[PDB]
Motif scaffolding. Structure first.
Motif, short mmCIF file in Angstrom:
data_model
loop_
_atom_site.label_atom_id
_atom_site.label_comp_id
_atom_site.label_asym_id
_atom_site.label_seq_id
_atom_site.Cartn_x
_atom_site.Cartn_y
_atom_site.Cartn_z
N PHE A 30 0.85 -1.17 0.00
CA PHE A 30 0.00 0.00 0.00
C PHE A 30 0.89 1.23 0.00
N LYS A 34 1.31 3.67 -2.90
CA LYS A 34 0.98 5.05 -2.63
C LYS A 34 2.10 5.99 -3.05
N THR A 35 3.35 5.55 -2.81
CA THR A 35 4.54 6.34 -3.13
C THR A 35 4.88 6.35 -4.61
N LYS A 39 0.22 11.11 -7.91
CA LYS A 39 -1.05 11.78 -8.12
C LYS A 39 -0.94 12.61 -9.39
#
Length: 42
Positions: A30, A34-35, A39
């Motif tokens: 995760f 996530k890293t 985004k």
């Protein structure tokens, strides 16, 4: 399988480390995901 067993059924006490490890692995995945998965913020 073990002894004190009771709830939290076996395949887990010798395997809680596996679970804990799985949780840690899921946390790492995760966290890595996530890293990695940047985004659209750049």
């Amino acid at each position: 399988g073990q002894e004190t067993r009771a709830g939290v059924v076996h395949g887990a006490i010798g395997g809680a480390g596996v679970t804990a490890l799985l949780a840690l692995c899921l946390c790492l995945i995760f966290f890595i995901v996530k890293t990695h998965r940047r985004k659209a913020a750049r």
